[PDB]
Amino acid sequence: GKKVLIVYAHQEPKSFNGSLKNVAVDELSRQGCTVTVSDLYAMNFEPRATDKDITGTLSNPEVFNYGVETHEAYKQRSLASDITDEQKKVREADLVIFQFPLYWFSVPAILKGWMDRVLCQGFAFDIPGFYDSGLLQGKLALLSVTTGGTAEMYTKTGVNGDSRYFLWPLQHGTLHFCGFKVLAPQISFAPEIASEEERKGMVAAWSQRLQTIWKEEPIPCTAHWHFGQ
Amino acid sequence: GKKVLIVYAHQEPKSFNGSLKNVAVDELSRQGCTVTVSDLYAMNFEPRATDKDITGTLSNPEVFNYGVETHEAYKQRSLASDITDEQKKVREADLVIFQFPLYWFSVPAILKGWMDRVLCQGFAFDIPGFYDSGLLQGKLALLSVTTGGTAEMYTKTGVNGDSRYFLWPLQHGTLHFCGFKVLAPQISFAPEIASEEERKGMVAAWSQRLQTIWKEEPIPCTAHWHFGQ
Numbered sequence: 001g002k003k004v005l006i007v008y009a010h011q012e013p014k015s016f017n018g019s020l021k022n023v024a025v026d027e028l029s030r031q032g033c034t035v036t037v038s039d040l041y042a043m044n045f046e047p048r049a050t051d052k053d054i055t056g057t058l059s060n061p062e063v064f065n066y067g068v069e070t071h072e073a074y075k076q077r078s079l080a081s082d083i084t085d086e087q088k089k090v091r092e093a094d095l096v097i098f099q100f101p102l103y104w105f106s107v108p109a110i111l112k113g114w115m116d117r118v119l120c121q122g123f124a125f126d127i128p129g130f131y132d133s134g135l136l137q138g139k140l141a142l143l144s145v146t147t148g149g150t151a152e153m154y155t156k157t158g159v160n161g162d163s164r165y166f167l168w169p170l171q172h173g174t175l176h177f178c179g180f181k182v183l184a185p186q187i188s189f190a191p192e193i194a195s196e197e198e199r200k201g202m203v204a205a206w207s208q209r210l211q212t213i214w215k216e217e218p219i220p221c222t223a224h225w226h227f228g229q
Numbered sequence: 230g231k232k233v234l235i236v237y238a239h240q241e242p243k244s245f246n247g248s249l250k251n252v253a254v255d256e257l258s259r260q261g262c263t264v265t266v267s268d269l270y271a272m273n274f275e276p277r278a279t280d281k282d283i284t285g286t287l288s289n290p291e292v293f294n295y296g297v298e299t300h301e302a303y304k305q306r307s308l309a310s311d312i313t314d315e316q317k318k319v320r321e322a323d324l325v326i327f328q329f330p331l332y333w334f335s336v337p338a339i340l341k342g343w344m345d346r347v348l349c350q351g352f353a354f355d356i357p358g359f360y361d362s363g364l365l366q367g368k369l370a371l372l373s374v375t376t377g378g379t380a381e382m383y384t385k386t387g388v389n390g391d392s393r394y395f396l397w398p399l400q401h402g403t404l405h406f407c408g409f410k411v412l413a414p415q416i417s418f419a420p421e422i423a424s425e426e427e428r429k430g431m432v433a434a435w436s437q438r439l440q441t442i443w444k445e446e447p448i449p450c451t452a453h454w455h456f457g458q
């Protein structure tokens with residue numbers, strides 16, 4: 001049996017991102033997987049890392065240290081319920097798919113906020129207690145990203161540089177750091193500029209890939225994979 | 230004369246980030262510069278990119294496209310006032326300093342939200358009108374980042390890889406894309422693990438650098454600068 005969490009960050013259900021999230025639910029549900037979706041915009045998910053993330057009394061109310069406070073709150077079961085609800089979904093998942101449009105070579109702020117607030121010390125990693133000593137080892141993660149720029153722009157000699165260059169903070173700095181095994185990213189280039197048939201083709205390629213997702217090996221999440229030849 | 234905008238993202242005024250922001254205000258004010266600070270957490274700055282960012286009739290209310298709607302809203306002067314207030318500060322600034330702790334090899338979500346919402350099409354870039362032709366051409370930008378990890382961890386052979394690797398989405402994908410000339414980053418490594426004297430030393434090195442900031446040349450914001458080869 002297999003459980004999947006899809007963390008989805010798009011405002012418009014009729015969007016191309018919406019279509020990719022819906023075909024992932026459809027395909028994984030067809031396989032008999034247990035599927036949960038965190039639709040961040042529909043949840044009005046809080047992105048800001050603030051003292052409202054800890055309930056009750058702070059370890060040090062005079063000098064607020066977000067990392068220290070959330071690490072202690074996690075251990076004391078005093079984190080805000082929106083964070084713990086997401087942590088329960090991650091803890092139970094075997095695969096976490098992130099579905100989002102690329103915003104400034106990174107995730108939209110609402111999804112950056114999910115990463116900042118949900119992946120706290122004690123839950124996803126400890127200090128020390130990261131990368132392969134991370135706490136989400138055994139779990140798979142996958143970035144399903146859509147872009148405005150064409151594939152050609154995202155080549156080593158292209159204006160944007162290779163698409164792997166922007167994946168480093170997300171795949172390595174975040175997912176690998178927490179102990180996830182990183183599956184190859186799904187990059188859907190320039191859907192708004194594509195034809196209706198080309199968009200249908202991109203959606204079908206993602207659905208087809210999901211049919212055999214449990215047979216994939218993760219990428220070697222190294223500097224060489226992201227920046228080398 | 231010169232005008233500086235400091236976009237600051239830290240919850241705690243007593244923090245090391247707070248000390249760096251304050252010494253920048255002190256030094257630039259001593260030089261006779263005009264200084265403005267956007268303290269994002271104190272402003273409870275909205276990070277989410279939503280339809281609340283447009284006040285008028287949407288160009289397409291049936292299928293919401295944030296990029297299209299904000300581009301049109303910028304041209305019509307129908308953007309939310311919190312965005313327009315930040316744009317006025319950026320338009321007037323000769324130098325924009327971003328002061329923040331590194332969160333997941335990137336900016337905290339509240340600051341990612343400032344980038345997503347403030348740097349809209351029509352204001353910060355256009356198509357064509359990006360990279361060396363970006364609309365913020367002639368302006369300088371500088372990232373002043375603090376980290377948990379030591380300098381040694383942020384080297385090519387270190388666990389985190391070189392610090393320049395994580396700068397790519399911010400310096401190139403965002404600042405250079407909008408036409409800014411990027412000054413060399415100020416990276417204050419591991420202040421929480423440092424001694425009180427070492428922290429004082431990092432604050433003084435930043436103040437000393439600011440004394441001659443107007444004499445600096447920008448970096449060559451290229452893939453070669455960030456990744457080598």
Ligand SMILES: Cc1cc2nc3c(=O)[nH]c(=O)nc-3n(C[C@H](O)[C@H](O)[C@H](O)COP(=O)(O)O)c2cc1C
Pocket residue numbers: 010015016017018100101102103104105106146147148149150191192278295296344345346402
């Ligand atoms: C705030 C913002 C920032 C964006 N930044 C990028 C970027 O860095 N690179 C890129 O290729 N496209 C960028 N885009 C374009 C989106 O990635 C693109 O519109 C989206 O992936 C299309 O998918 P959708 O039709 O489902 O929205 C940006 C769009 C917005 C609104």
Ligand SMILES: Cc1cc2nc3c(=O)[nH]c(=O)nc-3n(C[C@H](O)[C@H](O)[C@H](O)COP(=O)(O)O)c2cc1C
Pocket residue numbers: 049066067115116117173239244245246247329330331332333334335375376377378379420421
């Ligand atoms: C949500 C979160 C994510 C962080 N991610 C990183 C990271 O990617 N790399 C790093 O070296 N430190 C990371 N840190 C540690 C902070 O960068 C560090 O505590 C801060 O820069 C210290 O400055 P301050 O004392 O003024 O807060 C993170 C902290 C938090 C709370």
Ligand SMILES: COc1ccc2[nH]cc(CCNC(C)=O)c2c1
Pocket residue numbers: 066067068121127128177333376377378379
């Ligand atoms: C809440 O603190 C966080 C969150 C995510 C993180 N990624 C990297 C670090 C730096 C940790 N430094 C050492 C020496 O262990 C980190 C800290």
Ligand SMILES: COc1ccc2[nH]cc(CCNC(C)=O)c2c1
Pocket residue numbers: 104105148149296350356402403406
């Ligand atoms: C670094 O590339 C960026 C940064 C911000 C952006 N906002 C919107 C787009 C592209 C939107 N699609 C087209 C081709 O019009 C975009 C690209």
Ligand SMILES: [Zn+2]
Pocket residue numbers: 171172173176220221222223
């Ligand atoms: Zn890695």
Ligand SMILES: [Zn+2]
Pocket residue numbers: 400401402405406449450451
């Ligand atoms: Zn560049």
